[PDB]
Amino acid sequence: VFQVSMKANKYQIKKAVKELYEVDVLKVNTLVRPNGTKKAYVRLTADYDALDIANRIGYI
Amino acid sequence: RTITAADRRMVSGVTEKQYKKGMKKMQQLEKNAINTQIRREIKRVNFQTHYRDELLQ
Amino acid sequence: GRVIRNQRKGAGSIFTSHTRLRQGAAKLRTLDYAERHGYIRGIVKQIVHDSGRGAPLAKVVFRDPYKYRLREEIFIANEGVHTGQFIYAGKKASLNVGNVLPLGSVPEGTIVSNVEEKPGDRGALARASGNYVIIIGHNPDENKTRVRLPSGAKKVISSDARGVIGVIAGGGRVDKPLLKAGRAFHKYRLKRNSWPKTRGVAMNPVDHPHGGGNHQHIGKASTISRGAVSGQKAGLIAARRTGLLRGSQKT
Amino acid sequence: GKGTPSFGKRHNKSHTLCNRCGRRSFHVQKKTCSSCGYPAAKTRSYNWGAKAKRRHTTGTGRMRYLKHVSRRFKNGFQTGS
Amino acid sequence: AAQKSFRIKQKMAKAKKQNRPLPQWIRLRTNNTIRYNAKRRNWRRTKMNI
RNA sequence: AUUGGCGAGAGACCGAUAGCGAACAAGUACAGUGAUGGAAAGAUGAAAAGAACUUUGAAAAGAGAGUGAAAAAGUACGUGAAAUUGUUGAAAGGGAAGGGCAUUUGAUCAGACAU
RNA sequence: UCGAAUUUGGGUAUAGGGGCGAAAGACUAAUCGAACCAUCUAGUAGCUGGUUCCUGCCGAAGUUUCCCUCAGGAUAGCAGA
RNA sequence: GUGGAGGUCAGUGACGAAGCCUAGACCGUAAGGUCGGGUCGAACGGCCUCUAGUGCAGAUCUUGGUGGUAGUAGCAAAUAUUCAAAUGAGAACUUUGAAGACUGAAGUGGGGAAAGGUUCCACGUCAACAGCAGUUGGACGUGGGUUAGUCGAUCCUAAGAGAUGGGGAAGCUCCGUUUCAAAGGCCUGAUGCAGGCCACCAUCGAAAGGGAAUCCGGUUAAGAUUCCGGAACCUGGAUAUGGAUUCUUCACGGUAACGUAACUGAAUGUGGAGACGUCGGCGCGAGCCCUGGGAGGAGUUAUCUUUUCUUCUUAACAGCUUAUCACCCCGGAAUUGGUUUAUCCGGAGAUGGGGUCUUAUGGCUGGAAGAGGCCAGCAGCUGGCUCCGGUGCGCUUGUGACGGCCCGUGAAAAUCCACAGGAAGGAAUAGUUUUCAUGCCAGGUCGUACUGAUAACCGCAGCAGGUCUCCAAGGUGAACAGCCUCUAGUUGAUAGAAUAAUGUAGAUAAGGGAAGUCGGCAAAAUAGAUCCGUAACUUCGGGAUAAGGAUUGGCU
RNA sequence: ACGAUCAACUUAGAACUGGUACGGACAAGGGGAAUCUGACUGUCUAAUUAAAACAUAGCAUUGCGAUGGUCAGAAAGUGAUGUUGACGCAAU
RNA sequence: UAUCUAGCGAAACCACAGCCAAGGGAACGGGCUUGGCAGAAUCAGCGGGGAAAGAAGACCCUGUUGAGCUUGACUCUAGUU
RNA sequence: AAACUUUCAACAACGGAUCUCUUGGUUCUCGCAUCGAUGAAGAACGCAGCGAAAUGCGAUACGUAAUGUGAAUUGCAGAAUUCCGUGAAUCAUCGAAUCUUUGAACGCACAUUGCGCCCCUUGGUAUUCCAGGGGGCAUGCCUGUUUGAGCGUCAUUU
């Protein structure tokens, strides 16, 4: 789950995740939080672990 | 809730006692302003421009 | 005083006609070379009802002389025109019911309908249901013909003005009395919002010249002058005479 | 009645947010903002509305560029370093 | 309305951001005149008129 | 010429109900669908030194304690009037109270001999 | 009253001497025999109300004449300085 | 006497200026002046002059503040609350349980449109609000939450709005929407183009009209046709294999209606779908309702009850099959026949025999029992059953064929399809297509929580008002009338004690029966159904439920 | 001539029965003889007047053949009736 | 409901206030004068009075104040001929 | 006699007058001439470690660069030879930049965070389809450039 600038779309989020963290994404679901910022649920492929790369990023 | 707004305000410089006391002061000030507004507006709030008065005059 | 109802009806707004359901403008063919030299044949595909019009419309398919397209023209049906009938429009067309002929190519006493007022437009006279024009006579010297209009008026028009042979059909439509007010309501529901009409004598004096007074009476002469300005023309305008005829008054 | 019972039927919006100004005075059907004249080229102002001009005149906002023109003039619109 | 425009929702976000009392540390600044959030809005008391 | 803009200097001007509507988060809060309408609101102290601590109370708070030159300055804070209100003290009072003239009664008080 | 000249949502059109009116001067945002807002405008008023300290001296008129004059003015008179 | 200015008293003052209180004192007739006492903290005064925004009891004066009224009017519509326990300082009001009730499916239920904007949910919490209370809350403080190729917007056009070319107007701007115009984008093979094509006319306009395609189960504190699992479809685009198609170059079969796994087709034309009113009855389908057998559970059992309640479900999507209407072949009909509830059809070919089609809709199967449901056993696991039926003037709804009605005949466009045409291309590994199957990639942006109202919208508010719509059980009964109940939801509206007058609302009254009163105002009377009987008048349709009478249950 | 099987409320009748009750609660027309008035259904004074007022169909009158009648605009190469044509539009 | 109680708790209005008779008087006093009388504090009712409250009377008149409407008032005007 | 009511004083209340201050206003005088298609005024939304607002700013966001000064900012936290120095600062100056979506607002519209077209480039087995990055596409008018139109018209050619 990522906070995203409101100027970004699903293709941009997919490519950005693929670039920043080398994992293929299965799908992206974006919404606008009531506080006014994009929230993106990025579901990776089955062969990458979200719990693994999250603590790799730094938050457990 | 690993870190709370309580922790944020404690590092900002207001403890819990000061937070409660200042919040009570803020409610007090808002209530004083509200009381003043009702007291002043009661004088001329009932001035309907086009009231009917079934029994005319 | 206030702008009276008849004054208010020229600005449009709610007084425009209700033209949603009309099939289209009822007009003849353009005065093409083919039609003004010989004749062209069309086929009556369908006769339909036109909302707000008493006379049924007839749709005639015409081949386009200069292109493949099929120019479908919305005529006004004449009593006798039927689906599948061939309509021959032009100068060389034979004189049968539904054919369009220039008035210089028809013998005297002929009954025509949807008569062109001047050669070139697409039909002006005798298009209401049951109405017709009688070919009173010809004048080849000035290329004119004299005709008798539905209003009993005699007119002279260029002999190349066209006109459909027959009567507009739907005749006698005004014979049947609309019993309910609802019948008139639905009649004018497709016609320009001219109903119901409030009597000016029932109006207040601000709203109409006839209004006002302790009794519902006009008060002054209701025969209004022709030269009276807009807003005074309420009642009988430019009335030469009034009252019941009480005479033959011609037929 | 024309009062309380008829005040319950007002749930449409005659005006919405204008674009040129943030006022809630953009007539939806007329398509013209009733306070700033949008979409007309001239912002709708009148000399009988002295307070109206005072509310939206120059200086009531950020003046993102007009603020520095006095500085640049005082320095003579110099260039360089 | 539930079916709303993005401009309206952006104003919603602004209102939700603003809907908070005074930060407490501001009271402790020198020459502080602000006593309480005088622009505090609430849905039961004043409609946003947007 | 200049009631707009920028930069200055002044007044037999106004001094928080005055002076611009705005000395303050003022064309703000707020009302109206809309054009528009549109306020109230300055002052602890030199310095928070903004009352550690004890005790009663569930708590607000209270009583001590303490800071202070002053809490008769406690974020309701300079001074703190009047209307209006509480307690204490005095007096009067059979359908008004108040007032003028004159004195009895009670309370209170100056001056002068003392020079 | 309740199947139609029915009721109604949304869109849309008609804007103030204008609209709309099955016509009551009705409706036109609690405003209608001319809506609302701002400006002209501190509109004018022979009319109503008010008009803020003390003492001393003097101290009146409701009458003449003329005004679309009769709830008011000018003029003369009375009064002060 | 006051604000302010020039001069002066080398005036007063933190050892206390100004202000304020002072039934304490002095002076002046008075305006006022002076002094003492208390409070207080930083400036102020006498005199000679100058200056004015200079003196208040009024103006239904302005602003601000406060009184008697007065602990008074009152907190009385929407049937109704009670006991115990917990929590807590504190419980009529919070929570849980146990009762008693109500809304009674045109609800006090479950969702939405406009509107609101975080009210949604969690934790902490009572200063204020909840016209009593409060531990509770739509309140306060801090946070969490709204996941779309398929639902909408986006796209189309409706009523209408509106530039450009133009033309008016001093001008802000107005008319105008295809017209007094030199008004462009489509297919290509490669910005001409091989070159061709077309002459339409900017654009905006619906979160209820038209519209490409998604369903089930599960999941959260709050999400959901969006997430997860599974199973589909649409669009765009690459696109390979298989199949199909041919030397008779672009398929066969059927008498035909027409069938298929496909089975060339440019410009240009034609047609269809989109695309449509309302009502009445009839047929069919779905869902609900009623009910039988049976397989489980629960309730009742003084007595009876083969009992009463309850679960037994099958989505989108795909294959096969399925129909009224319609049509085709044979045959040629009066002794006229067929047929609807409704009278229409037949030598323009009926009845009849045999067939074709649309697939609304239903059946079977796959989806899929592995789901969900209902039970039992053991400590989450393991097992089972989830089956077979019946009926209808039943309710809602869909649909078909019809019929009635109109001086009412009851949208447009986007878009998609087909057809006529034969431009162009394809011949024997020469190939051409790929409206057949399978395979591959992608589907952006915005909306998505909650209420939708006797508390979340508007009415100054937590106002008995107003605000559009969907679903809709049982009994009585003609009835989505009234009354009672089931699922669901509430139990909210300050409360306690007594029962005076006068009230508001509901009622009843002996005898008389409008004598009351302006007036039978208010009330009462009759009332449903069946049978009988029904006048004057009439526009012949009505009057008419005229008037006036009788019967009405239960059980066999 | 005709048998078996299955199925639904609808009407009529007859006994018996009761404190003669029985549309048992709910629900639910008072009627008749006339007069004035408006044909009727409908509509309006939202917030004192719902009527005999307005409207209505019916009848009648008037203008107009488009270079036109009625009406709008400040003007227009402007507009409504008019997607119209006397069985029509417009005014009474 | 009223009434009593716990909690909560306004408003209208108010020159000062509240016993009468008569007299005079702005010709109908609560106050003035002459008389009658007059004892704290109060509760529930009540509608005689307070010329009770609500509103600068709308009826009428005045104003050298208007407005709607009408016409053959006075003076003009769009349009039209 | 109490209660109650009234009058006054003391203390205490409600209220914010009086007095005294004043980073404000008002009026006068003096000097200056400087908005914007190189995108103004105005708007919307966002930005701080901890801000709702005011003030400041624009995804480089209470700001970056340059210069001057020369050790702070401050409510807290943090940073601290960062300080005998290219160097603190919510400093001053300001000549370089950034300047979201808008707005005269300019690709077409806008109640859409809608819909295009062109150029270069990157990826998806791609000139066409999809996606990402960068740059553009208004009108009126002028001068000029290029391409044209008109038997309006000249000369020349068959």
Swiss-Prot record, chain A:
- Disulfide partners: none
Q: Where in the cell is it found?
A: Cytoplasm
Q: What does this protein do?
A: Component of the ribosome, a large ribonucleoprotein complex responsible for the synthesis of proteins in the cell. The small ribosomal subunit (SSU) binds messenger RNAs (mRNAs) and translates the encoded message by selecting cognate aminoacyl-transfer RNA (tRNA) molecules. The large subunit (LSU) contains the ribosomal catalytic site termed the peptidyl transferase center (PTC), which catalyzes the formation of peptide bonds, thereby polymerizing the amino acids delivered by tRNAs into a polypeptide chain.
State the similarity comment.
Belongs to the universal ribosomal protein uL23 family.
What's the subunit arrangement here? Answer: Component of the large ribosomal subunit (LSU). Mature yeast ribosomes consist of a small (40S) and a large (60S) subunit. The 40S small subunit contains 1 molecule of ribosomal RNA (18S rRNA) and 33 different proteins (encoded by 57 genes). The large 60S subunit contains 3 rRNA molecules (25S, 5.8S and 5S rRNA) and 46 different proteins (encoded by 81 genes). uL23 is associated with the polypeptide exit tunnel.
Report what the protein is called.
Large ribosomal subunit protein uL23
Instruction: Please tell me the species this chain comes from.
Output: Saccharomyces cerevisiae (strain ATCC 204508 / S288c)
From Swiss-Prot, chain C:
Q: Which SMART domains match?
A: Ribosomal_L2, Ribosomal_L2_C
GO cellular component terms, semicolon-separated: cytosol; cytosolic large ribosomal subunit
**The entry's keywords:** Cytoplasm, Isopeptide bond, Phosphoprotein, Ribonucleoprotein, Ribosomal protein, RNA-binding, rRNA-binding, Ubl conjugation
- Where this protein primarily resides, as one coarse class? cytoplasm
Keyword Ribonucleoprotein found: yes
Q: Where in the cell is it found?
A: Cytoplasm
Q: Where is this cross-link: Glycyl lysine isopeptide (Lys-Gly) (interchain with G-Cter in ubiquitin)?
A: K45, K92, K118, K144
Superkingdom, taxonomy of origin: Eukaryota
Residue numbers carrying Phosphoserine: S51, S94, S158, S159, S248
Q: Name one GO molecular function term.
A: structural constituent of ribosome
Q: What does this protein do?
A: Component of the ribosome, a large ribonucleoprotein complex responsible for the synthesis of proteins in the cell. The small ribosomal subunit (SSU) binds messenger RNAs (mRNAs) and translates the encoded message by selecting cognate aminoacyl-transfer RNA (tRNA) molecules. The large subunit (LSU) contains the ribosomal catalytic site termed the peptidyl transferase center (PTC), which catalyzes the formation of peptide bonds, thereby polymerizing the amino acids delivered by tRNAs into a polypeptide chain.
Family designation = Belongs to the universal ribosomal protein uL2 family.
> Subunit comment for this entry?
Component of the large ribosomal subunit (LSU). Mature yeast ribosomes consist of a small (40S) and a large (60S) subunit. The 40S small subunit contains 1 molecule of ribosomal RNA (18S rRNA) and 33 different proteins (encoded by 57 genes). The large 60S subunit contains 3 rRNA molecules (25S, 5.8S and 5S rRNA) and 46 different proteins (encoded by 81 genes).
Curated annotation (Swiss-Prot), chain D:
Gene3D superfamilies given for it? 2.20.25.30
A Pfam family of the record is Ribosomal_L37e
Q: Where are the zinc fingers (C4-type)?
A: 18-36
Tell me the SUPFAM superfamilies matching this sequence.
Zn-binding ribosomal proteins
**Family under the similarity heading:** Belongs to the eukaryotic ribosomal protein eL37 family.
Listed NCBIfam families: PRK04179.1
Quaternary structure and interacting proteins, as annotated: Component of the large ribosomal subunit (LSU). Mature yeast ribosomes consist of a small (40S) and a large (60S) subunit. The 40S small subunit contains 1 molecule of ribosomal RNA (18S rRNA) and 33 different proteins (encoded by 57 genes). The large 60S subunit contains 3 rRNA molecules (25S, 5.8S and 5S rRNA) and 46 different proteins (encoded by 81 genes).
- Described function: Component of the ribosome, a large ribonucleoprotein complex responsible for the synthesis of proteins in the cell. The small ribosomal subunit (SSU) binds messenger RNAs (mRNAs) and translates the encoded message by selecting cognate aminoacyl-transfer RNA (tRNA) molecules. The large subunit (LSU) contains the ribosomal catalytic site termed the peptidyl transferase center (PTC), which catalyzes the formation of peptide bonds, thereby polymerizing the amino acids delivered by tRNAs into a polypeptide chain.
Q: What is this protein called?
A: Large ribosomal subunit protein eL37A
Source species of the chain: Saccharomyces cerevisiae (strain ATCC 204508 / S288c)
Q: What is the lineage of its organism?
A: Eukaryota, Fungi, Dikarya, Ascomycota, Saccharomycotina
From Swiss-Prot, chain E:
Q: Which gene encodes it?
A: RPL39
Q: Which GO terms describe its molecular function?
A: structural constituent of ribosome
**Coiled coil where?**
none
Q: Where in the cell is it found?
A: Cytoplasm
Q: What does this protein do?
A: Component of the ribosome, a large ribonucleoprotein complex responsible for the synthesis of proteins in the cell. The small ribosomal subunit (SSU) binds messenger RNAs (mRNAs) and translates the encoded message by selecting cognate aminoacyl-transfer RNA (tRNA) molecules. The large subunit (LSU) contains the ribosomal catalytic site termed the peptidyl transferase center (PTC), which catalyzes the formation of peptide bonds, thereby polymerizing the amino acids delivered by tRNAs into a polypeptide chain.
Assembly and oligomerization: Component of the large ribosomal subunit (LSU). Mature yeast ribosomes consist of a small (40S) and a large (60S) subunit. The 40S small subunit contains 1 molecule of ribosomal RNA (18S rRNA) and 33 different proteins (encoded by 57 genes). The large 60S subunit contains 3 rRNA molecules (25S, 5.8S and 5S rRNA) and 46 different proteins (encoded by 81 genes). eL39 interacts with YIH1.
Report the family membership: Belongs to the eukaryotic ribosomal protein eL39 family.
Q: Which UniProt keywords apply?
A: Cytoplasm, Ribonucleoprotein, Ribosomal protein
Could you tell me what this protein is called? Large ribosomal subunit protein eL39
The record's Gene Ontology cellular component field reads:
cytoplasm; cytosol; cytosolic large ribosomal subunit
